[PDB]
């Protein structure tokens, strides 16, 4: 029952925090890269 | 370097609060498996360095 | 019990948006309800889904962190401030800046759009608020007459035009025409840092350590006092029923009546798994156009999206 | 002394677009020339005003809310050996979903320092 040091949880879980109603989105990276663009032109 | 040695100190402090991670049977087996391979080649072991070693 | 107020519903967090590498300064939503900006302070602007609550794009370009964002509402345009000294505008179908607002002397707090000229209005820290042709990029006035650092900022298409509050705890009611003040009202003890207009009914409010305090537009007349809620707030925004919210530095959030200023709801939130005790805060937050989402920018580098309690009274008073 | 903080800024009203124009002067920058001289308006199927003015937001929202929501639901020998199976039941423990706001103890970091010292 030993945790190793790469491990270490610190830090309780999103989930146990805010609890089941709560939807926890971690939101890196990003879909529509930056030339796909905000407001369509009229083409 | 600083970053890294934040992280070092951090380290360090949890093997001495953590325990070992080494789990003291598996110790003894490997200190048992390198007795038996020491045993098994007839290794003479390293004397102290002589007060009239010649070389 | 001199009023009765009208019976609002409870408002609960149902989501929690996560991705911002710096404290989230700002937020606000697009006239469609199809997207929402955040300007934070790792120097992104982050447009995210509204619906789904995922990152659709992040915009770079900011060389400090990112005080004020706004949305165009009849040019397809995005502002941003930053502590930068810069203003930018946004070309959206192009996602590149096209033009910067060169003349603040130190970090640019907010920023407001007037709604029917084409005119940008902007705080600093040096004291100033100036005016700015979007389309010529030049400064037609500089609002001066604060004697700190200036703190929020609306704007109108009716008399005042202009309404700032300031580090120096006091209010000026400006002429956007003349360039010069028309009202000061001096009443809090500590820095205003909220302002807010109501979208009927010809009020504001303003908030500070101290109370927030009703107010009639056309000289600044006294209406009210709306005290409880006591800790730096940053943020006030009001829903077309009433319905004021309070913000602050602590991370406490109350939920207020408008026309009676009863609290009927603090909500306190935790902070992020990561996160510090001390590190709970909100520096935002805005209605979704359909007046039922509640965004909040907290100092836990999060968004926190509320919707309204459909499990019904349980409450007054 | 020489090496000093500010404890009050530069207050703006004093020079070149402030009172006069620093009284009309004939001074200016490269970045000042004319450029992007048209305002561009939102159109009929961007998000004009008057499009969006007769529109139900709440009945929309609900209604993309439930498809993301729908989306995001449908989506999901030598047998003398001295150690034997060390890895038995672990299935890779998820710590690259967390997300800790931590800059030395999130996931980021420690992949960082783990590539970069060597």
């Known amino acids: 029952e030993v945790v190793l040091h790469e491990d270490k949880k610190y830090y309780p879980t999103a989930e146990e925090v805010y609890g089941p109603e709560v939807e926890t989105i971690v939101q890196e990276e990003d879909t529509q890269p930056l030339t796909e663009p905000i407001i369509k032109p009229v083409k | 370097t600083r970053l890294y040695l934040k992280a070092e100190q951090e380290r360090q402090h949890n093997y001495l609060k953590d325990g070992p991670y080494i789990t003291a049977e598996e110790a003894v087996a490997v200190y048992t498996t390198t007795v038996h391979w020491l045993e098994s080649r007839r290794f003479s072991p390293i004397p102290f360095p002589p007060l009239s070693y010649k070389h | 019990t001199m009023p009765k107020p009208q019976w609002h519903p409870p408002w609960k967090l149902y989501r929690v948006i996560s991705g911002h590498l710096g404290w989230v300064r700002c937020i606000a939503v697009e006239p469609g309800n199809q997207w929402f900006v955040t300007g934070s302070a790792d120097r992104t602007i982050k447009i995210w889904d509204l619906a789904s609550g995922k990152l659709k794009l992040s915009l770079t370009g900011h060389i ?36 910067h607002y060169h003349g603040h002397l130190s970090a640019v707090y907010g920023l407001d759009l007037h709604p029917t000229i084409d005119v940008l209005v902007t705080c600093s820290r040096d004291s100033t608020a100036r005016i700015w042709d979007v389309r010529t990029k030049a400064s037609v006035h500089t609002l001066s007459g604060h004697t700190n650092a200036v703190a929020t900022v609306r704007c109108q298409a009716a008399e005042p035009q202009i309404i700032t509050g300031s580090h120096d705890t006091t209010i000026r009611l400006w002429d956007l025409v003349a360039g010069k003040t028309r009202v000061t009202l001096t009443n809090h003890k500590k820095s205003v840092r909220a302002v807010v207009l109501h979208p009927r009914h010809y009020t504001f409010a303003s908030g500070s350590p101290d109370n927030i305090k009703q107010w009639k537009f056309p000289d600044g007349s006294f209406i009210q006092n709306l005290s409880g809620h006591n800790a730096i707030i940053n943020t006030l925004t009001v829903n077309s029923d009433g319905v004021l919210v309070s913000g602050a530095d602590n991370g406490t959030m109350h939920l207020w009546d408008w026309r009676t200023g009863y609290n009927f709801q603090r909500v306190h939130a935790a902070v992020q798994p990561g996160s510090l005790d001390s590190e709970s805060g909100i520096f935002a937050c805005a209605f979704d156009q359909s007046e039922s989402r509640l965004l909040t920018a907290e100092a836990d580098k999060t968004i926190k999206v509320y919707r309204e309690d459909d499990t019904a009274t349980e409450e007054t008073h | 002394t020489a090496a000093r903080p500010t404890f009050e800024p530069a207050r ?47 009945r929309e929202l609900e209604e993309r809310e439930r498809a993301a929501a729908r989306e995001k639901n449908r989506d999901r020998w030598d047998d003398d050996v001295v150690f034997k199976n060390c890895a038995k039941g672990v299935d890779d423990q998820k710590k690259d979903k967390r997300f800790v706001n931590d800059t030395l103890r999130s996931e980021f970091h420690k992949k960082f320092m783990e590539k970069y010292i060597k």
């Open chain 3, 64 to 99: 400090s962190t990112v005080r004020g964002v706004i949305v165009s509402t009849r040019s397809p345009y995005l502002f941003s401030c930053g502590e930068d000294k810069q203003v930018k505008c946004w070309d959206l179908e192009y996602n590149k800046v096209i033009r």
């Open chain 4, 12 to 58: 703006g009203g004093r020079g070149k677009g402030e009172g006069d124009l620093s009284q009309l002067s004939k001074q200016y920058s490269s970045r000042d020339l004319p450029s992007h001289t048209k305002i561009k308006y939102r159109q009929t199927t961007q998000d004009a005003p008057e499009e969006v003015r007769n529109r139900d937001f709440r």
